Amino acid sequence: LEVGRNSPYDYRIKSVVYNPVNVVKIDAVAGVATHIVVAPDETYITHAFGDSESRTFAHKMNHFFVKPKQAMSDTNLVIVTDKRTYNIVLHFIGEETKKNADGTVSKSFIET
Amino acid sequence: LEVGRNSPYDYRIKSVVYNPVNVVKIDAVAGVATHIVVAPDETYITHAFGDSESRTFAHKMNHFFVKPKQAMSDTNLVIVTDKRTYNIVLHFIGEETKKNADGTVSKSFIET
Amino acid sequence: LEVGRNSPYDYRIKSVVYNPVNVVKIDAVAGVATHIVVAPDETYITHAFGDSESRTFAHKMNHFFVKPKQAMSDTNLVIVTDKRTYNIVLHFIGEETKKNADGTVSKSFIET
Amino acid sequence: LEVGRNSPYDYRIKSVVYNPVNVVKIDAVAGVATHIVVAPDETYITHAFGDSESRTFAHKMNHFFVKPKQAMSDTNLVIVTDKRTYNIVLHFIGEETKKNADGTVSKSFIET
Amino acid sequence: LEVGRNSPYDYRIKSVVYNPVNVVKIDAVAGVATHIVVAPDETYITHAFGDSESRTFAHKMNHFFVKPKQAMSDTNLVIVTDKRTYNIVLHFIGEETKKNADGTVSKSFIET
Amino acid sequence: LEVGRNSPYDYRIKSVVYNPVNVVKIDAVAGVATHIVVAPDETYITHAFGDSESRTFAHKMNHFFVKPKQAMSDTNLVIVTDKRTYNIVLHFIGEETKKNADGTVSKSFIET
Amino acid sequence: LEVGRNSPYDYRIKSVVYNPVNVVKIDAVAGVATHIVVAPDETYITHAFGDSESRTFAHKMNHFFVKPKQAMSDTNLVIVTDKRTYNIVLHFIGEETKKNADGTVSKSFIET
Amino acid sequence: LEVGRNSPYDYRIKSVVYNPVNVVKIDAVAGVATHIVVAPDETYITHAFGDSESRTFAHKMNHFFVKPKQAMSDTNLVIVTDKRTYNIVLHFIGEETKKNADGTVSKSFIET
Amino acid sequence: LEVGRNSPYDYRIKSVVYNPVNVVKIDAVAGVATHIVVAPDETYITHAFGDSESRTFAHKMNHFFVKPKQAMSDTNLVIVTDKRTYNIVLHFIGEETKKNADGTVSKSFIET
Amino acid sequence: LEVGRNSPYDYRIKSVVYNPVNVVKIDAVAGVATHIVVAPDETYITHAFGDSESRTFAHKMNHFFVKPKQAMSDTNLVIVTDKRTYNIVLHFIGEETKKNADGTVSKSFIET
Amino acid sequence: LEVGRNSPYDYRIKSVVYNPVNVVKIDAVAGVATHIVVAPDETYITHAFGDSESRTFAHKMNHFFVKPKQAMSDTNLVIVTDKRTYNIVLHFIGEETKKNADGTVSKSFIET
Amino acid sequence: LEVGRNSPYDYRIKSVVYNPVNVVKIDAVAGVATHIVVAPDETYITHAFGDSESRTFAHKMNHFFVKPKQAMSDTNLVIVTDKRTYNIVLHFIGEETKKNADGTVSKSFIET
Amino acid sequence: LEVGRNSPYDYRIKSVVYNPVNVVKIDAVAGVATHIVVAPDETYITHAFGDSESRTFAHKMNHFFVKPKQAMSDTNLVIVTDKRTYNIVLHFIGEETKKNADGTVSKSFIET
Amino acid sequence: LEVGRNSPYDYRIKSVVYNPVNVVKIDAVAGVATHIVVAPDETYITHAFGDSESRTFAHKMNHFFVKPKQAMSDTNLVIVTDKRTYNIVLHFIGEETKKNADGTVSKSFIET
């Protein structure tokens, strides 16, 4: 939506539709105060993800993973957010009867 | 009715009758704060559907599905709302003794 | 009575007697905020019928049915209200000991 | 009494005695807010009868019946009130120990 | 007493003694708001009798009966009050131990 | 005493002694608001007697009886009060142990 | 004492001693509001006697008895008070242990 | 003491000693509001004696007895008080253990 | 002490010592409001003695005894107080364990 | 101490030491409001002794004993206080465990 | 300490050290309001000792003993305080576990 | 982040990304009021670590270890913070289901 | 510390270190309001010791012991405080687990 | 830190690092209001140590030990604080699971 999403959505909206640049599909298991993830390069300001406070640590490339695992369920929360370029593919299917996490996303993210 | 329906109906009204352009038949299992769906191209503003927060994700065409499934019942909530052109056919028959969902709709939707 | 009946009757009155044009016999199982049905062509404003929120959906002719079924009983609530011309024949006999629904009506309705 | 009786009697009074024109014998099982029945031709304003809200529906002649049946008892509540001319014959004998309904009336009614 | 007796007596008084014209012997089982019966020809105003609200209905002559029967007991409440001339003979003997109804009356009544 | 005795005595007094004209011996079983009986010819105002509201009804002569019977006991309450001349003889002996009713009276009464 | 004794004594006093004229010996069973008996000829005002409201009724002479009997005991309460001349002899001996009634009196009484 | 003793003593005092004229020995069983007995000839004012309200009644001489008997005990309460001359001899011995009544008196009493 | 002792002592004091004239030894069983006994000749004012209200009655001489006996015990309370001259000898020994009454007195008493 | 000791000591003090004249040894069982005993010749003012109100009565000499006996114990309370000269010897030994009464005194006492 | 010690110590202090004149060793079982003992010759003011109110009585010499015995224990409380010269030797050993009374004193005491 | 981090993070943020100089990875089991560790050379101000108050004590080099061990679990909390140069490698894996401590850090730290 | 220590320490302090003159080691079992012991020669003001109020009594030399024994334990509380010169050696070891009394002191004390 | 540490730390801080002069390592089992130990030479002001109030007493050298033993555990609390020079070596290992006392210190301390 805006630069910094800064939003609990509350849930999905009038996603300001775009070309894939500014807006990214931040969604996947989320909630844990993520203003926006991706953009801007200025302070989102920052997010926790996975409704946890774990996140991956090794560096993939320049841009490099993070991956809170939420529950025991499949919780491949990635946010390769370095602030270089940026590729991540989320999916989600936890407690099968959930608040539909099923659909999965991918994020592109140029800052440039 | 108006541009943005913006309404809980409360229930069906003096649907401002038309040619099929502006007003669409948004109805089907609904409730989950859908102002209007379809029109306008300006902010409806947006809807949840299916009284859920699931919705389809793949892209059909340009205009492309979304489909919250409400209950376990037959809940083919489609809103192919892209904002290109637009075709969707809803029907509804859940808990057979319901608040008559039986009758089913179709939506046309040119923005043009 | 008036243009828009706009009334819970409360019950039948000094029905402003007429030729069959303006006033129609709206009666049959009713209650669910029907201001007036039929006339005017301007906003009645609108009615629910059948003390439900079901109503028929196919289009008969131009003017075309609607038919909330109230209970399980015989509840042929028709209001073919299109706003073309208009023919409907109601009858009523539900829970035999009711608040006499027995007598049945017919509605004419020219707007012209 | 007056033009529009407009009265719960409370019960029978100094019935303004007449020739049978203006005043009619409205009595029989009554109560259900009947101002006056018969006269005037202007708004009585209107009555329910039979302490019910049933009334006959077919048209006898121009002037034509109405007949709420009160209880299961003999309740031939007629009010052939069209506002043409007007003939009706009431009688009453319900729960034999009642508030004497026994005596029965007849109504004439010219408006002319 | 006065023109319109207009009185619950409270009970018998200084009955303004007369020739039988104005004052009549209204007494017999009474109570049910009878102002005066008989005279005047102007509004008594009116009476119920018999402590009931029954009264006879056929027309005897011009002046013609009315006869609430009070209880099951002998309750020949007559008031032939037409406002022509006027003859009635009351008697009373109900629950033998009563508030002495035993003595019985007769009413004359010229208005002329 | 006075013209109209108008008194509950309270009980017997300084009966203004007389010749038998004005004052009469009203006494016998009494109480039931008898102002005075007999005199004056103007409004006593009136009495009930016998502590009842029965009284005799036939006409003896011009002046003519009345006779409330109080209890079952010997209760020959007479008041032949017409307002012609006037003769009555009371006696009293009810519940033998009473408030001495034993002594009995006679009333003369000229108005003239 | 005074003209009208007018007194509950309270009990016997400084009986204003006399010749037997004015003051009389009113005493005997008394109490029942006797102001004075005997004198004056003007309003005592009056007495009940015998603590009852019985009193003798026949006429002895001009001056003539009265005799409330108080209890069952010997209660020869006489007051021959006519207001002519006057002779009476009281005595008293009731419930033998009483408030000494034993002593008995006689009354003279000239008014002259 | 004074003219009218007028006193409950409270009990015996500084009896104003005398020659036997004015002051008399009133004592004996007393209490029942005796101001003074004997003197003066003017209003004592009066006494009851014997703590009763009995007193003797026959006339002895001019001056003549009175004799309330108090209890069952020896209670020769005399007060021959006429207001002529005057002789009485009291004694007292009731409930032997009493408030010493034993000592007995005599009264002289000239008024002269 | 003073003329009229007028005192409850409270108990024995600085008895104003004397020659035996004014002050006397009043003591012996006492208490019952004796101001002073003996002197003065003016009002002591007076005493009861013996804590009773008995006292002797015969006359001894001019001056003459009085003798309340207090209890059953030896209670020779004498006060020969006439107001002539005066001789009395008290002693006391009642309930042997008492408030020492043992010691006994004698009273002289000239007024002269 | 002072002239009139006038003191509850409270207990023994700075007895103003002397020659044996003014101050005397009043002590022995005491308490019962003895201001001072002995001196002065003016009002001590007076004492009770022995915590009693007994005291000796015979006269020894001019100056002469008094002797309240306190308890049953040895209680030779003497105070030969006449106000002549004066000799007394007290001792004390009552309830052997007492508030030491053991020590005994003697009193001299010239007033002169 | 001061002239009159006048003190509950509270307990031993900065005893103003001396030559043995002014200050004396008052101590031994004490407490019972002893201001100072010994000095001054002016009012200490006075002491009780021994926490009692016994004290010796015979006269030793001019200066002469006093000796309250406190308890049953060894309680040779001497204070030979005459106010001549003065010798006394106290010791103390009562309830062996006491508030150390063990140490014993001697008092000198010149006033001179 | 800032010079002195001075922060409870609250948890990881928009870590002001850097070259490894200023910001260090302070993280590992922490909480116990660590403002910042490492930088600045000015007052962080200081930290506790390990959520304890233990820390290593020997000196490694100039810059030299500290190592609170938190729980029993693997708690190699090092902070070689001397303020020379600085090398430390943390890791963490305590209660395996923890608040992910798993990922481990390393700190560089030039002050220069 | 100061001249007069005047202190509950509260416990040992910055003992103003000295040569052994002014400050002395007062310590040993203490508490019982000892301002200072030893110095000054002016009012300490004074001490109790031993948390008792016993103290030795004989005189050693000029300067001479005092020795409250506190408990049953070894409680050689000496304070040879005369105010001449002064030697005392305390030690302490009472209830072996105490508030360490173990260490023992010695006091020097010149006033000079 | 400062001259007088004067601090409960609260716990270890930004120990103002030094050469070993001013700041000393006061630590070891402590708590018992130690402002600073060692420096300054001016009033720390003073400390208790060992969370006790024991401390060593003999003099080692000029500068000389003190050693509260805290618990039963190894509690070699030394503070050789004389204020000469100064050497002490603390260690600590009490209740093995403690608030890490394990690490041990040494103190240097020149005042010079």
GROMACS .gro file of N, CA and C in nm, chain M residues 31-90:
model
  180
 1375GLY      N    1   2.537  -0.218   7.420
 1375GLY     CA    2   2.410  -0.188   7.361
 1375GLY      C    3   2.335  -0.100   7.456
 1376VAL      N    4   2.339  -0.137   7.585
 1376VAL     CA    5   2.261  -0.073   7.687
 1376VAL      C    6   2.313   0.068   7.702
 1377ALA      N    7   2.230   0.164   7.656
 1377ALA     CA    8   2.262   0.299   7.617
 1377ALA      C    9   2.394   0.346   7.668
 1378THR      N   10   2.502   0.307   7.598
 1378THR     CA   11   2.630   0.364   7.625
 1378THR      C   12   2.653   0.466   7.520
 1379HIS      N   13   2.658   0.594   7.561
 1379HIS     CA   14   2.693   0.695   7.466
 1379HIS      C   15   2.835   0.667   7.429
 1380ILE      N   16   2.931   0.726   7.501
 1380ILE     CA   17   3.063   0.669   7.498
 1380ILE      C   18   3.090   0.616   7.635
 1381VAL      N   19   3.191   0.528   7.650
 1381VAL     CA   20   3.234   0.501   7.784
 1381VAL      C   21   3.342   0.602   7.808
 1382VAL      N   22   3.465   0.551   7.828
 1382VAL     CA   23   3.591   0.617   7.854
 1382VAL      C   24   3.579   0.766   7.852
 1383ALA      N   25   3.654   0.829   7.760
 1383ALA     CA   26   3.650   0.970   7.740
 1383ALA      C   27   3.508   1.009   7.721
 1384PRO      N   28   3.483   1.137   7.723
 1384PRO     CA   29   3.575   1.237   7.770
 1384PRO      C   30   3.577   1.224   7.919
 1385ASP      N   31   3.638   1.323   7.988
 1385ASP     CA   32   3.622   1.335   8.129
 1385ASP      C   33   3.495   1.410   8.150
 1386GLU      N   34   3.453   1.490   8.050
 1386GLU     CA   35   3.324   1.551   8.063
 1386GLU      C   36   3.223   1.444   8.037
 1387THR      N   37   3.095   1.477   8.060
 1387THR     CA   38   2.986   1.383   8.055
 1387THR      C   39   2.989   1.315   7.923
 1388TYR      N   40   2.986   1.180   7.923
 1388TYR     CA   41   2.992   1.108   7.799
 1388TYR      C   42   2.877   1.151   7.712
 1389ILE      N   43   2.751   1.134   7.758
 1389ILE     CA   44   2.717   1.100   7.893
 1389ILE      C   45   2.696   0.953   7.905
 1390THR      N   46   2.661   0.911   8.028
 1390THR     CA   47   2.709   0.788   8.083
 1390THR      C   48   2.651   0.672   8.011
 1391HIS      N   49   2.699   0.553   8.050
 1391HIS     CA   50   2.667   0.430   7.986
 1391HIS      C   51   2.606   0.342   8.090
 1392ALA      N   52   2.521   0.248   8.044
 1392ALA     CA   53   2.504   0.126   8.114
 1392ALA      C   54   2.591   0.031   8.038
 1393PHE      N   55   2.623  -0.086   8.096
 1393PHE     CA   56   2.696  -0.177   8.014
 1393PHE      C   57   2.628  -0.308   8.024
 1394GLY      N   58   2.684  -0.408   7.954
 1394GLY     CA   59   2.646  -0.544   7.974
 1394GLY      C   60   2.505  -0.564   7.936
 1395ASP      N   61   2.440  -0.459   7.881
 1395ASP     CA   62   2.301  -0.469   7.850
 1395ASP      C   63   2.232  -0.513   7.974
 1396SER      N   64   2.284  -0.467   8.088
 1396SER     CA   65   2.226  -0.498   8.214
 1396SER      C   66   2.228  -0.372   8.295
 1397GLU      N   67   2.218  -0.386   8.427
 1397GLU     CA   68   2.237  -0.274   8.513
 1397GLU      C   69   2.294  -0.332   8.638
 1398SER      N   70   2.404  -0.406   8.619
 1398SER     CA   71   2.484  -0.456   8.725
 1398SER      C   72   2.616  -0.395   8.697
 1399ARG      N   73   2.701  -0.382   8.799
 1399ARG     CA   74   2.833  -0.341   8.764
 1399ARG      C   75   2.912  -0.346   8.889
 1400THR      N   76   3.044  -0.360   8.874
 1400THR     CA   77   3.121  -0.391   8.990
 1400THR      C   78   3.147  -0.265   9.066
 1401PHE      N   79   3.181  -0.286   9.195
 1401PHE     CA   80   3.130  -0.208   9.303
 1401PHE      C   81   3.245  -0.188   9.396
 1402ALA      N   82   3.325  -0.294   9.413
 1402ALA     CA   83   3.442  -0.277   9.492
 1402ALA      C   84   3.525  -0.181   9.417
 1403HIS      N   85   3.626  -0.124   9.484
 1403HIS     CA   86   3.711  -0.037   9.410
 1403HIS      C   87   3.840  -0.109   9.392
 1404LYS      N   88   3.888  -0.116   9.266
 1404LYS     CA   89   4.008  -0.189   9.242
 1404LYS      C   90   4.118  -0.105   9.295
 1405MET      N   91   4.154  -0.002   9.216
 1405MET     CA   92   4.246   0.099   9.259
 1405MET      C   93   4.166   0.224   9.268
 1406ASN      N   94   4.232   0.340   9.247
 1406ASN     CA   95   4.161   0.460   9.217
 1406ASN      C   96   4.068   0.424   9.108
 1407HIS      N   97   4.122   0.412   8.986
 1407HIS     CA   98   4.038   0.365   8.882
 1407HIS      C   99   3.998   0.228   8.920
 1408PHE      N  100   3.872   0.193   8.895
 1408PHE     CA  101   3.832   0.071   8.957
 1408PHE      C  102   3.723   0.010   8.876
 1409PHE      N  103   3.711  -0.123   8.887
 1409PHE     CA  104   3.638  -0.205   8.795
 1409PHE      C  105   3.497  -0.157   8.789
 1410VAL      N  106   3.424  -0.200   8.684
 1410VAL     CA  107   3.284  -0.231   8.698
 1410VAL      C  108   3.263  -0.351   8.612
 1411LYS      N  109   3.166  -0.437   8.645
 1411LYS     CA  110   3.157  -0.553   8.562
 1411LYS      C  111   3.017  -0.605   8.563
 1412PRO      N  112   2.931  -0.553   8.479
 1412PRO     CA  113   2.807  -0.618   8.450
 1412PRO      C  114   2.840  -0.751   8.393
 1413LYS      N  115   2.774  -0.858   8.440
 1413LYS     CA  116   2.777  -0.983   8.369
 1413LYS      C  117   2.653  -0.987   8.287
 1414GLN      N  118   2.665  -1.011   8.155
 1414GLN     CA  119   2.544  -1.007   8.079
 1414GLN      C  120   2.468  -1.133   8.107
 1415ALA      N  121   2.487  -1.237   8.024
 1415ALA     CA  122   2.408  -1.356   8.040
 1415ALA      C  123   2.477  -1.447   8.137
 1416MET      N  124   2.456  -1.579   8.118
 1416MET     CA  125   2.520  -1.677   8.200
 1416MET      C  126   2.653  -1.703   8.138
 1417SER      N  127   2.661  -1.675   8.006
 1417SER     CA  128   2.777  -1.697   7.926
 1417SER      C  129   2.889  -1.616   7.982
 1418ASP      N  130   3.009  -1.629   7.920
 1418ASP     CA  131   3.124  -1.559   7.967
 1418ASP      C  132   3.102  -1.417   7.934
 1419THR      N  133   3.090  -1.333   8.038
 1419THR     CA  134   3.051  -1.199   8.014
 1419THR      C  135   3.133  -1.116   8.105
 1420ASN      N  136   3.262  -1.104   8.072
 1420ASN     CA  137   3.348  -1.028   8.158
 1420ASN      C  138   3.348  -0.889   8.107
 1421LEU      N  139   3.238  -0.818   8.134
 1421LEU     CA  140   3.232  -0.682   8.093
 1421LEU      C  141   3.299  -0.604   8.199
 1422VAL      N  142   3.414  -0.544   8.166
 1422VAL     CA  143   3.480  -0.463   8.263
 1422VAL      C  144   3.477  -0.325   8.210
 1423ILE      N  145   3.457  -0.228   8.298
 1423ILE     CA  146   3.495  -0.096   8.261
 1423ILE      C  147   3.550  -0.035   8.385
 1424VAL      N  148   3.685  -0.029   8.395
 1424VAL     CA  149   3.749   0.011   8.517
 1424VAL      C  150   3.740   0.159   8.529
 1425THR      N  151   3.635   0.217   8.470
 1425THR     CA  152   3.628   0.357   8.448
 1425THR      C  153   3.611   0.421   8.582
 1426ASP      N  154   3.718   0.490   8.626
 1426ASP     CA  155   3.715   0.572   8.744
 1426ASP      C  156   3.709   0.709   8.691
 1427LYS      N  157   3.809   0.734   8.604
 1427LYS     CA  158   3.854   0.862   8.559
 1427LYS      C  159   3.980   0.893   8.633
 1428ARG      N  160   4.063   0.790   8.659
 1428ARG     CA  161   4.201   0.820   8.684
 1428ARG      C  162   4.270   0.786   8.557
 1429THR      N  163   4.369   0.697   8.570
 1429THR     CA  164   4.408   0.620   8.458
 1429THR      C  165   4.317   0.501   8.457
 1430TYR      N  166   4.355   0.396   8.382
 1430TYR     CA  167   4.250   0.310   8.336
 1430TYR      C  168   4.311   0.196   8.262
 1431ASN      N  169   4.293   0.071   8.313
 1431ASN     CA  170   4.326  -0.047   8.237
 1431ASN      C  171   4.213  -0.146   8.251
 1432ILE      N  172   4.169  -0.206   8.137
 1432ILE     CA  173   4.071  -0.312   8.141
 1432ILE      C  174   4.096  -0.403   8.024
 1433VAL      N  175   4.071  -0.535   8.042
 1433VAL     CA  176   4.079  -0.621   7.927
 1433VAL      C  177   3.951  -0.696   7.912
 1434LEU      N  178   3.878  -0.669   7.802
 1434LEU     CA  179   3.756  -0.742   7.780
 1434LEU      C  180   3.787  -0.859   7.693
   0.00000   0.00000   0.00000
